[PDB]
Design an enzyme around this catalytic site. Structure first.
Site, PDB file in Angstrom:
ATOM      1  N   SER A 200      86.895  34.765  48.583  1.00 21.43           N
ATOM      2  CA  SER A 200      88.232  35.171  49.042  1.00 21.43           C
ATOM      3  C   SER A 200      88.159  35.443  50.543  1.00 21.43           C
ATOM      4  O   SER A 200      87.682  34.562  51.272  1.00 21.43           O
ATOM      5  CB  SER A 200      88.739  36.350  48.209  1.00 21.43           C
ATOM      6  OG  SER A 200      90.131  36.563  48.390  1.00 21.43           O
ATOM      7  N   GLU A 327      93.438  30.206  40.272  1.00 25.02           N
ATOM      8  CA  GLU A 327      93.439  30.992  41.499  1.00 25.02           C
ATOM      9  C   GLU A 327      94.639  31.929  41.649  1.00 25.02           C
ATOM     10  O   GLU A 327      94.516  32.995  42.258  1.00 25.02           O
ATOM     11  CB  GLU A 327      93.402  30.061  42.719  1.00 25.02           C
ATOM     12  CG  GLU A 327      92.077  29.317  42.947  1.00 25.02           C
ATOM     13  CD  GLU A 327      90.961  30.236  43.444  1.00 25.02           C
ATOM     14  OE1 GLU A 327      91.242  31.426  43.703  1.00 25.02           O
ATOM     15  OE2 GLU A 327      89.803  29.785  43.559  1.00 25.02           O
ATOM     16  N   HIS A 440      90.965  34.445  39.962  1.00 24.33           N
ATOM     17  CA  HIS A 440      90.338  34.569  41.275  1.00 24.33           C
ATOM     18  C   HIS A 440      89.335  35.722  41.265  1.00 24.33           C
ATOM     19  O   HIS A 440      89.682  36.855  40.911  1.00 24.33           O
ATOM     20  CB  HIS A 440      91.472  34.826  42.279  1.00 24.33           C
ATOM     21  CG  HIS A 440      91.047  34.921  43.712  1.00 24.33           C
ATOM     22  ND1 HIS A 440      90.815  33.811  44.494  1.00 24.33           N
ATOM     23  CD2 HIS A 440      90.901  35.995  44.527  1.00 24.33           C
ATOM     24  CE1 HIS A 440      90.501  34.197  45.718  1.00 24.33           C
ATOM     25  NE2 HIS A 440      90.538  35.518  45.762  1.00 24.33           N
TER      26      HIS A 440
HETATM   27  C1  LIG Z   1      90.912  37.747  48.654  1.00 23.31           C
HETATM   28  C2  LIG Z   1      92.176  37.434  49.456  1.00 23.31           C
HETATM   29  O1  LIG Z   1      89.994  38.431  49.500  1.00 23.31           O
HETATM   30  C3  LIG Z   1      91.212  38.575  47.384  1.00 23.31           C
HETATM   31  C4  LIG Z   1      89.940  38.943  46.603  1.00 23.31           C
HETATM   32  C5  LIG Z   1      90.240  40.088  45.619  1.00 23.31           C
HETATM   33  N1  LIG Z   1      89.115  40.476  44.723  1.00 23.31           N
HETATM   34  C6  LIG Z   1      89.665  41.288  43.622  1.00 23.31           C
HETATM   35  C7  LIG Z   1      88.428  39.305  44.177  1.00 23.31           C
HETATM   36  C8  LIG Z   1      88.121  41.275  45.439  1.00 23.31           C
END
Ligand SMILES: *[C@](C)(O)CCC[N+](C)(C)C
Ligand SMILES: *[C@@H]1O[C@H](COC2O[C@@H](C)[C@@H](O)[C@@H](O)[C@@H]2O)[C@@H](O)[C@H](O)[C@H]1NC(C)=O
Ligand SMILES: *[C@@H]1O[C@H](CO)[C@@H](O)[C@H](O)[C@H]1NC(C)=O
Ligand SMILES: *[C@@H]1O[C@H](CO)[C@@H](O)[C@H](O)[C@H]1NC(C)=O
Ligand SMILES: *[C@](C)(O)CCC[N+](C)(C)C
Ligand SMILES: CC(=O)CCC[N+](C)(C)C
Ligand SMILES: CC(=O)CCC[N+](C)(C)C
EC number: 3.1.1.7
Lengths: 536, 535
Positions: A200, A327, A440
């Protein structure tokens, strides 16, 4: 005093702790300071290197979590809570963690550096899913993870200012990278073989290091899981960063006038006062949008990620990129009416049209119409199951899948060696409902190897799968190729190219090769919608 | 002293027909029956007047003149083009109709099928071999009628609001023929209370306009539209565009007040009008024709679009459909890179150029949207995919998606609709393989030409033709293409907005499919208009 647990780094001596891994022991050195505490006047400022220390520093426990918003959507719910801080919040948070084989590896081992996600507003290296013990023990790897500042503390920017120049959380990351170059040989790591991986906003961060020259001398390979520097959420212009920082200041009562005066007033505010108004500065009702993120400053990022991916030379780089099967599902429960963990989330067509404005908040009326018309199944236009899954797909494609396909294609065309994947296995222990699929973030536990711990109750096939993934990732770290160099076949994982567009499915079955990551749909997002903006 | 079974009286007087051989037996043919005063001289561009009665017995044993028209020169000597060319003398004295009936004529009143030919409103004739009514007459016992109607400038040149050239007179020619059937078809044993219109391409568009025009609606009961529709990009023009085209044509032939302009056009040789007819189109194009039906506020009281959206069609049964490769025929008439004489493997540059020619009203943005939608992003430069996508573009834009739109709007407004896709390529087709099953190559099967052994169709094609003839005549008779007795054979269900069901017509038994290019026709019928509307 176990001599395997005593290491001298440039700053002084450390004492680690021996941890139990299912296969045998590992050495863990947790909570090592790599920067001066960014507190008081150092708030919003670039990090400075940690002053050396006397005696032996206790590196047996995780340090504090960087100050951040705590999730309250579903209190007591493991599916959300497992991402929330598991240590105390502090602005004093610039520490890193190293795991190594016990005994210390005899010859220099490849290093993997994890960068966590959390929309640049959250996260910590201390979460159970980021536990490096399995990779260290089983694959003999040296694993590193750092805390970096998030939210206003990491990314609030008044561009052009000395006092809050922007991107300081990425500078935190880079400082940890420099630390690894200088110190990792003491743990048996090879500083000439460093692989960044993250997920992410962490994946976006890894891509920002690929696109920023001073970071390029600090690693050799990259893995971007479900995130990219390019795309709708990972960066803002200088103008928009300034606007958001100015609004937040106004909301907490600062100061307007002078950058210095505004920033000085922001430094007086209790940390929770800043977090309380963090979300109120976004221009639209949205999901998968985050208020304080990396800014195109003309410094860390010399141009937009788009400009930099299109015109870069990536000839001596190897990259592994991919996405999870669903996702978008995670983000829908945080803003789109009709969506919940607690029901099947079967929605009306009306709720679908509404959700698209929230899921694609920068879209004009006409671009939103184009999205609704492209994602509608015209054979089943009002069927709630289709509408729900289409809503998930919109959010996931806009924000992750199509950005990934874009990056993969440009890196390959610009001379990079690229491998791509889609991750399709849903954890048997997932607490989110079935409709969300493979959400995700839920590949990470497999790549880090948690299923090898039998107390966690994964299945036998999930353990064999985890072991496969740990090998792909560490093979890639070792050689820039995830294929096993002596295992004849498994069908081989081929490089992603712009001609063939080959990628693989990672699930409980043997690797399968596919062609084209959402090719038609990503032409919509990556090629047509941009023209719809430029033309009108 | 002559065959008593070939002598018949109609409103205008006595006729003598001819006994023709069909493979299963004789049929009666009454060919070249005049239904209007010759639209010549001062009557050029004017509505048709009914034929003044004649004295004595009119010989109705041969086809009459073809309406004055452009003759195709693309591939001289080539059967694929020549089979559609005029096969009788060209004249403006051309308003004749043809009737085929069983021999001897039916004793009880028989359902009537009226054929309206296509050819872009610039060409065609009821006398062409593929429109031969003898097989339907002989095998199904049908009464078949086909009329000539004026085409090109003669049929469709309009100065809207004028008395002297009001537009749509080729449609009025058709209407008069329908009126003639109502008055006279009982003399041949036809049932004027069961008249089904059918036609292809422009002929189908024509059928649709009779549905949408109230005075025509009293003159038939059911309709079949084959590869054409009243709605869509080519079948109609606005009043303003018709005038613009009429006025430019006038200039190009040396005719610079409407009465004066029209008086001057009436002095020009018919061939001089045909020679300049193509020069008035606003763009380099394919599947576009200069002189077509105009939205006049009279025959067409509003746009076909407005009329299909707000009409009440509770009392209507319709059969509509398309062929597998609607666009391929048109590519050789103006897209650089396409030919009957090679595989027409084109480049990507030639695809983008072809999209502008095939969607000539499209802005740059709309054209980009078309290209991105029809590109295969796995093989974006593959010449075989590009050729076939060029075909699909032209076919979906001009035929398939208009038909999908029509079918849905009729079903939602109360009509009983049946839909097909025709997928058999005649073994005798002289066009190359890459063209697939082109526009127009279903007609020969519906008319039953495979039944003629001199034509060298296969045995399987004979049986296929017989099936088609049954669906069409069953529909004519009952408003349902299915046979009420034959149970276990697959049924052809009505098309509905909910289920979108339609059947494949090929050598295999009926297969029910769902959604007529649903995703792609959403692009053409729902999105592109909004792209236009917003920009
Ligand atoms: C991304 C935009 O960083 C979201 C990731 C969220 N988690 C729950 C996987 C950490
Ligand atoms: C296919 O033909 C097109 C039409 O021109 C010709 O027809 C072919 C069969 C040749 O005999 C040519 O010499 C004629 O002029 C061409 O424009 C097109 O380029 C041809 N396709 C290819 C790639 O050969
Ligand atoms: C599912 O749950 C939420 C809250 O409990 C609710 O708002 C939503 O409407 C529910 N789904 C539907 C549409 O029944
Ligand atoms: C049909 O086949 C015959 C016998 O082979 C051939 O000589 C004749 O020319 C063909 N006729 C047509 C209509 O093609
Ligand atoms: C339509 C636009 O009328 C075209 C019909 C063409 N033929 C060749 C099939 C008559
Ligand atoms: C979990 C997210 O992505 C956003 C959470 C922030 N709000 C609860 C304010 C939407
Ligand atoms: C066959 C057609 O569609 C029309 C051809 C007309 N020109 C040859 C003049 C372009």
């Amino acid at each position: 005093e176990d001599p395997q647990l005593l290491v001298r780094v440039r700053g002084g001596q450390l004492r680690g702790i021996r941890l139990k891994a299912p296969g045998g022991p590992v050495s863990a050195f947790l909570g090592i300071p790599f920067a001066e505490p960014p507190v008081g006047s150092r708030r919003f400022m670039p990090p400075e290197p940690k002053r050396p220390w006397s005696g032996v520093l206790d590196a047996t426990t995780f340090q504090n979590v960087c100050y951040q918003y705590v999730d309250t959507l579903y209190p007591g719910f493991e599916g959300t809570e497992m991402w929330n801080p598991n240590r105390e919040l502090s602005e004093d948070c610039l520490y890193l963690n190293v795991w190594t084989p016990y005994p210390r590896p005899a010859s220099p081992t490849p290093v993997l550096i994890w960068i966590y996600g959390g929309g640049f507003y959250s996260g910590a290296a201390s979460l159970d899913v980021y536990d490096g013990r399995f990779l260290a023990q089983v694959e003999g790897a040296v694993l590193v993870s750092m805390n970096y500042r998030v939210g206003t503390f990491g990314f609030l920017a008044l561009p052009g200012s000395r006092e809050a120049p922007g991107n300081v959380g990425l500078l935190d990351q880079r400082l940890a990278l420099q630390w690894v170059q200088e110190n990792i040989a003491a743990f048996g790591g090879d500083p000439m073989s460093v692989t960044l991986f993250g997920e992410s906003a962490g994946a976006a961060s890894v891509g920002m290091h690929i696109l920023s020259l001073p970071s390029r001398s600090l690693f050799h390979r990259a893995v971007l899981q479900s995130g990219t520097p390019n795309g709708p959420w990972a960066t803002v212009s200088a103008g928009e960063a300034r606007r958001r920082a100015t609004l937040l200041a106004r909301l907490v009562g600062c100061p307007g006038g002078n950058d210095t005066e505004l920033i000085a007033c922001l430094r007086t505010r209790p940390a929770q006062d800043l977090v309380d108004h963090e979300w109120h500065v976004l221009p639209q009702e949205s999901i998968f949008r985050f208020s304080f993120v990396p800014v195109v400053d003309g410094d860390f990022l010399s141009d937009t990620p788009e400009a930099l991916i299109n015109t870069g030379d990536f000839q001596d780089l190897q990259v592994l990129v991919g996405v999870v099967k669903d996702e978008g599902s995670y983000f829908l429960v945080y803003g789109v009416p009709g969506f919940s963990k607690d029901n099947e989330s079967l929605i009306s067509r009306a709720q679908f049209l509404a959700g698209v404005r929230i899921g694609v908040p920068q879209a004009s009326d006409l671009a939103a119409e184009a999205v609704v018309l492209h994602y509608t199944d015209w054979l089943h236009p009002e069927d709630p199951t289709h509408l729900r899954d289409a809503m998930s797909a919109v959010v996931g494609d806009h924000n992750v899948v199509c950005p990934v396909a874009q990056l993969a294609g440009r890196l390959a065309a610009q001379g990079a060696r690229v491998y791509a994947y889609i991750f399709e296995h849903r954890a048997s222990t997932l607490t989110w409902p079935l409709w969300m699929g493979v959400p995700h973030g839920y590949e990470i536990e497999f790549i880090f190897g948690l299923p090898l711990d039998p107390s966690l109750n994964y299945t036998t096939e999930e353990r064999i799968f985890a072991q496969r993934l740990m090998k792909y990732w560490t093979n890639f770290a070792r050689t820039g190729d995830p294929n096993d160099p002596r295992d004849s076949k498994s069908p081989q994982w081929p490089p992603y190219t712009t001609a063939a567009q080959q990628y693989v499915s990672l699930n409980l079955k043997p690797l399968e090769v596919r062609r084209g990551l959402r090719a038609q749909t990503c032409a919509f997002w990556n090629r047509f919608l941009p023209k719809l903006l430029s033309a009108t």
